[PDB]
Amino acid sequence: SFSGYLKLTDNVYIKNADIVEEAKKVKPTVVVNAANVYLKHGGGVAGALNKATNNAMQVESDDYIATNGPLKVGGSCVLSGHNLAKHCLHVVGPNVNKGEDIQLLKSAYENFNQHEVLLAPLLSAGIFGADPIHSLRVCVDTVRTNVYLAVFDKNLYDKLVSSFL
Numbered sequence: 001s002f003s004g005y006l007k008l009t010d011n012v013y014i015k016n017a018d019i020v021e022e023a024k025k026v027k028p029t030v031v032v033n034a035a036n037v038y039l040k041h042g043g044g045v046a047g048a049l050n051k052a053t054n055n056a057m058q059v060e061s062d063d064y065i066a067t068n069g070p071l072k073v074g075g076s077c078v079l080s081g082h083n084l085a086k087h088c089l090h091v092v093g094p095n096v097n098k099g100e101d102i103q104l105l106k107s108a109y110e111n112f113n114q115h116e117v118l119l120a121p122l123l124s125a126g127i128f129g130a131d132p133i134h135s136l137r138v139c140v141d142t143v144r145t146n147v148y149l150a151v152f153d154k155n156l157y158d159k160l161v162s163s164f165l
């Protein structure tokens, strides 16, 4: 099971870890990808998860978009977790660097409530351009299921713990 996490609330846990390395160790039922609407997994968490699957995540994702069209910002889809997890929940948080509405971050975290336990990154933070302190606050105030957050950047992890209310 999950180890070395700091408990933040009744249901939210956090650790300074690379989500690919965590997924390889734990083999969680669900790993969350920080996806975009086209499921083009180029960089950040998505680029890292897809590389760890030897591009199988991108081949599956292209077939999903060909059949279904793009996701909505704030939406999600459940696809295979390949060699990392049973499932991958691809969730699209708003990208502030593309000018998207930060108010959609709560809708994006609501997708997590459809799963009892998840390994996840902070949505909309990192290269998506939003404040990670705000993303952690929306996560705690929105997700009711058990979420294990992997924060890759050590300096960011220390900042998030020290500023958590």
Ligand SMILES: Cn1cnc2ccc([C@H]3CCC[C@H]3C(=O)O)cc21
Binding pocket: 017, 018, 019, 020, 034, 044, 045, 048, 121, 122, 123, 124, 125, 126, 127, 132, 150, 151, 152, 153, 156
């Ligand atoms: C590259 N990579 C691997 N595992 C990750 C988990 C998280 C992240 C990003 C998501 C937004 C906040 C940022 C971070 O926690 O440092 C990137 C990762």
